[PDB]
Design a protein around this nucleic acid. Structure first.
Ligand SMILES: [Mg+2]
Ligand SMILES: [Mg+2]
Ligand SMILES: [Mg+2]
Ligand SMILES: [Mg+2]
Ligand SMILES: [Mg+2]
Ligand SMILES: [Mg+2]
Lengths: 49, 110, 52, 354, 92, 48, 95, 143
RNA sequence: UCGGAGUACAAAAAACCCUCCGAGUGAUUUUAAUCUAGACAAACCAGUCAAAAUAACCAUAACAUCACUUAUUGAUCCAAAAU
């Protein structure tokens, strides 16, 4: 999903990337009142990154 | 009245698999109360006298001779009291194996 | 005649309690059981009485 | 509803009435003997023997072999009787039998076994191990002549090859010696073949040695057809069977099609059908000798593969079938939580869109 | 294996002594990982198993203890071929 | 500290184990011998 | 079950569902066997293991639990170190 | 490529002894209501007739593999008084040597509990052990 | 409430304020473990078996037995124990 967002230009690597620009690029949606504490990296696309 | 406790449902004891039915390992072939069908080849015995298939294959029902355990005193006494022309015959449940034990495949050529 | 229910505790130092029926007029019981935390054959003694 | 039996009942022969007059066996061993005698008869109902592979039951065995030796039965019986009487005549035999201390010369017992019933015993070992099935199919022979194969490991170490033995290829790397008793009036053919071990063809066999037109006992002076090759089983599949066959031939026969060259390492050239080869020369050869051994993989197989045959060595594995699972239900009822682990593909968390 | 210059000579010969079943005809030691779907994890397993092979051949205190449960058949059949082995007649 | 106390109790009670096993087996053996000898003495007294 | 509440006008849930049941995301419902803490000295080891096993719920029970459960508990949840996270999804279902 | 390098992906081994010596062959587990238990590859069968002594090594098919009997003339001119314990010793030693010659090293012997306490069967087992044949066959691999 | 026989004669099931036996536990040591294929049965709750795989002990050693053995038994919640 990260490589898909970067390759489609939703988020960029020239600027440091965080959860703010991830939400701004609509890659993840966080619901704090559902007591999410943030975003965990998962290793599904480790070979093609 | 005078007779009480006559109400009891059946325990569903009977024959489950026939001859020609294909079973896998662990399938209960028959359940029984006293020894009606005896286990034969590739058929296990549980402590409630149920017969379960040990190998995957086709169930057969067969009549052969009864040679009991010498440690079983009543059985060997029944053997002792038989006349000389008499042999015991009982019925047995077998499972003929269908699949082979395994195959040899080339995994690496060095 | 009545039986009593007695709790048996391990002598291997590990806490393991298992319940056994034993006859009331008999003495204190001591058996040889299996402890699944030590994986050895463990002597067990009668420690407490729970149920009549 | 009652039906009529198709043949006799087992226990209908004895009389039900007057049970006291009928003799009883009081021995469980007597019942064991009687039941094992009763179980071998072809009953008309469904039996274990019918279902569990009796290998066609009664089989008309075609015999392709040497005549049995004609020995006078009455003279043989009287000389055996006189030897037995002179044996029981001694008192020290009675002493050694009573005091539980007596030994027998097992080498002489083995020699008289090889002369007397060793052929029939080796025939039943070959029938059990399926030597006749994969070489001559329904045809069988009695290994009449004694035959001894031995492998020279070093100066004094000599490893024999008897019926059904087990020899490592380190012992069998070199050419063996073959010993059998024969006068100089006949011609012999020795053929060592590997019945299992052909790579491409499951119905074909390998030649490991072949020598033809052997004058008498002397194997070396016979004309050399196919070179000796060390045993090469696979690393995975073990216990290939190697058989030495000895044929008695009357005329001097030369082969132009069966001749193999001097190095001859090509396994396409080393491809055999013993059935068709005996079909080619049935009129000349009659099989008289046989000795076969099992053989598994060792470190000496690797050099035979690499240096001699120019091979990348194949390695096999014994792979069992996968365990059976039923069809997966959408709502399993009264099943453990591990029911999904039976049908899970791999133990890796996969995220489709996340 | 013969040109692997990052290991010592006794370790290099001992890997050929024990692990000759993994050695190709051209002198190539070949190691294979299958377990994980991720080839990075497979490579990490490869290097971990390679470290396990190197450490063992490099330790002179390794006595190479062999399990008896799978070797009782081999030991009994080894003694039993040694029974027929015992005859002494000179040959060749 | 709790794990080390558990390990010390395990090793301390395992260092005393076969002597406890043999003492309990010997105690039960002398109990059986005492009962059998009492029955033999009662039978020998009642037979006379 | 209160289908329409008096304060908010929403559909309430029964806490007796949550206090003993677990809902996976495939629709499957997980539960404990009845009587696993009762009379352990009397029952055999195989029976004790069978009562200690977790079990699933069938169709009618699962639909009853889904009807008595509001839509909060049917959401997708990503807990840290969740043992049932591996069991949340369904695979190889050929129906 | 090299012509000789061609190989089938699945190897067919037609030897019936391969699975038995690799101990992955199917034993006939089950029965239990009858005796003896038919879970074996090879079984030692001792028939002690009032005249002769006959020992067999039987496969589960019912065929005899190797037999040593005192009905044989080869033993018969070598022993005295065909019935003895010494005759059982001769049978045991001859069958142990024949089993070593035939390559069978494991078998199951299931004696009757009064035959187990007998003098002849016990020292016949002693002769089988000293002969090199190990009784009580090894356990099946993935049974 | 639970079990055995007939009713219900041959796979299963099958009722009556139908006819007869019982059970609400004793005795003994062999004190009877963990995990997991595949099944019987069943509305649900329950109940039954169980090969392979580990550890215990002959150093490749898992059925507690007998009394017609079949019944010898009770769900949540809550209380006391405390692991
Ligand atoms: Mg979310
Ligand atoms: Mg009834
Ligand atoms: Mg009813
Ligand atoms: Mg005669
Ligand atoms: Mg059903
Ligand atoms: Mg098991």
């Amino acid at each position: 999903r990260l490589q898909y967002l970067i390759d489609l230009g939703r988020v960029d690597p020239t600027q440091p990337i965080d959860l703010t620009q991830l939400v701004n690029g609509r890659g993840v949606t966080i619901q704090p009142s559902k007591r999410d504490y943030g975003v965990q990296l998962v290793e599904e696309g480790a070979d093609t990154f | 009245s005078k007779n009480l406790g006559g109400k009891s449902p059946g325990k569903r004891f009977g024959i489950k698999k026939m001859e020609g039915h294909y079973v896998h390992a662990g399938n209960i072939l028959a359940t029984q109360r006293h020894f009606r069908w005896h286990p034969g080849a590739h058929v296990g015995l549980g402590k409630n006298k149920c017969l379960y298939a040990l190998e995957e294959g086709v169930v057969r029902y067969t009549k052969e001779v009864y040679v009991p355990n010498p440690s079983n005193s009543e059985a060997v006494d029944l053997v002792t009291r038989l006349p000389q022309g008499a042999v015991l015959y009982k019925t047995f449940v077998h499972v003929v194996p269908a699949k082979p034990e395994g195959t040899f495949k080339l995994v690496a050529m060095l | 005649s009545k039986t009593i229910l007695v709790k048996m505790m391990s002598q291997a130092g590990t806490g393991f309690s298992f319940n056994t029926k034993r006859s009331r007029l008999r003495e204190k019981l001591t058996l040889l059981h299996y402890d699944p935390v030590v994986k050895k054959k463990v002597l067990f003694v009668e420690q407490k009485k729970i149920r009549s | 509803r009652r039906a009529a039996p198709l043949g006799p009942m087992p226990n209908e022969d004895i009389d039900v009435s007057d049970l006291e007059r009928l003799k009883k066996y009081r021995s469980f061993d007597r019942y064991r003997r009687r039941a094992e005698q009763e179980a071998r008869k072809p009953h008309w109902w469904r039996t274990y023997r019918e279902h569990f592979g009796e290998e066609s039951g009664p089989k008309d065995r075609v015999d392709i072999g040497l005549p049995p030796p004609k020995v006078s039965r009455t003279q043989q019986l009287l000389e055996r009787k006189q030897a037995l009487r002179e044996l029981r005549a001694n008192v020290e035999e009675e002493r050694a039998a009573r005091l539980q201390t007596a030994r027998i010369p097992l080498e002489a017992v083995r020699a008289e076994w090889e002369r007397t019933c060793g052929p029939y015993h080796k025939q039943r070992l070959a029938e059990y191990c399926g030597l006749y099935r994969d070489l001559f199919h329904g045809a069988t022979f009695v290994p009449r002549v004694p035959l001894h194969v031995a492998y020279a490991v070093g100066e004094d170490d000599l490893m024999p090859v008897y019926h059904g033995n087990e020899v490592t290829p380190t012992e069998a790397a070199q050419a063996p010696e073959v010993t059998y008793e024969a006068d100089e009036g006949s011609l012999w053919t020795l053929l060592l073949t590997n019945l299992d071990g052909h790579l491409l063809e499951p119905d074909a066999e390998y030649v490991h040695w072949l020598v033809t037109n052997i004058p008498g006992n002397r194997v070396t002076e016979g004309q050399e057809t196919c070179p000796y090759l060390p045993p090469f089983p696979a690393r995975g599949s073990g216990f290939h069977r190697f058989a030495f066959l000895l044929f008695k031939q009357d005329k001097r026969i030369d082969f132009s099609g069966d001749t193999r060259p001097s190095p001859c390492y090509q396994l396409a050239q080393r491809t055999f059908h013993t059935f068709d080869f005996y079909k080619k020369h049935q009129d000349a050869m009659t099989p008289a000798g046989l000795a076969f051994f099992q053989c598994r993989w060792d470190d000496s197989v690797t050099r035979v593969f690499h240096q001699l045959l120019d091979m990348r060595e194949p390695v096999f594995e014994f792979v069992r079938p996968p365990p059976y699972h039923p069809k997966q239900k959408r709502f399993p009822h009264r099943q453990p939580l591990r029911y999904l682990d039976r049908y899970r593909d791999s133990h890796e968390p996969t995220y489709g869109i996340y | 294996l013969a040109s692997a210059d990052w290991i010592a000579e006794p370790v290099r010969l001992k890997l050929a002594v024990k692990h000759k079943n993994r050695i190709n005809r051209s002198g190539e030691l070949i190691l294979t990982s299958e377990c994980s779907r991720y080839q990075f994890r497979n490579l990490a397993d490869c290097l971990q198993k390679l470290r396990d092979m190197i450490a063992e051949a490099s330790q002179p205190a390794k006595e190479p203890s062999r399990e008896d449960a799978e070797l009782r058949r081999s030991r009994i059949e080894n003694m039993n071929r040694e029974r027929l082995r015992k005859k002494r007649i000179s040959s060749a | 500290q709790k794990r080390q106390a558990r390990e010390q109790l395990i090793e301390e009670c395992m260092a005393k184990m076969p002597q406890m096993i043999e003492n309990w087996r010997q105690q039960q053996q002398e109990r059986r011998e005492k009962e059998q000898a009492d029955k033999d003495r009662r039978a020998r007294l009642q037979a006379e | 079950v209160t289908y329409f509440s008096s304060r908010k006008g929403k559909r309430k849930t029964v806490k007796a569902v949550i206090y003993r049941f677990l809902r996976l995301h495939s629709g499957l419902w997980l539960r404990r066997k009845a009587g696993y803490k009762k009379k352990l000295w009397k029952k055999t080891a195989a029976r004790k293991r069978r009562l200690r096993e977790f079990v699933f719920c069938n169709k009618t029970q699962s639909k009853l639990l889904d009807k008595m459960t509001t839509s909060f508990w049917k959401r997708r949840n990503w807990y840290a170190d969740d043992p049932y996270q591996k069991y949340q999804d369904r695979t190889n279902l050929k129906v | 490529p090299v012509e000789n390098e061609a190989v089938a992906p699945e190897f067919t081994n037609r030897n019936p002894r391969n699975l038995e010596l690799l101990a992955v062959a199917r034993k006939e587990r089950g029965w239990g209501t009858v005796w003896p238990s038919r879970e074996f590859w090879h079984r030692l069968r001792v028939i002690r007739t009032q005249h002769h002594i006959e020992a067999l090594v039987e496969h589960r098919n019912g065929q005899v593999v190797v037999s040593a009997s005192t009905r044989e003339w080869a033993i018969k001119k070598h022993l005295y008084s065909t019935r003895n314990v010494v005759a059982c010793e001769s049978v045991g030693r001859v069958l142990a040597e024949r089993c070593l010659e035939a390559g069978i090293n494991f078998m199951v012997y299931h004696p009757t509990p009064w035959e187990a306490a007998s003098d002849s069967i016990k020292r016949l087992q002693h002769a089988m052990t000293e002969g090199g044949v190990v009784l009580r066959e090894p356990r099946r691999i993935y049974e």
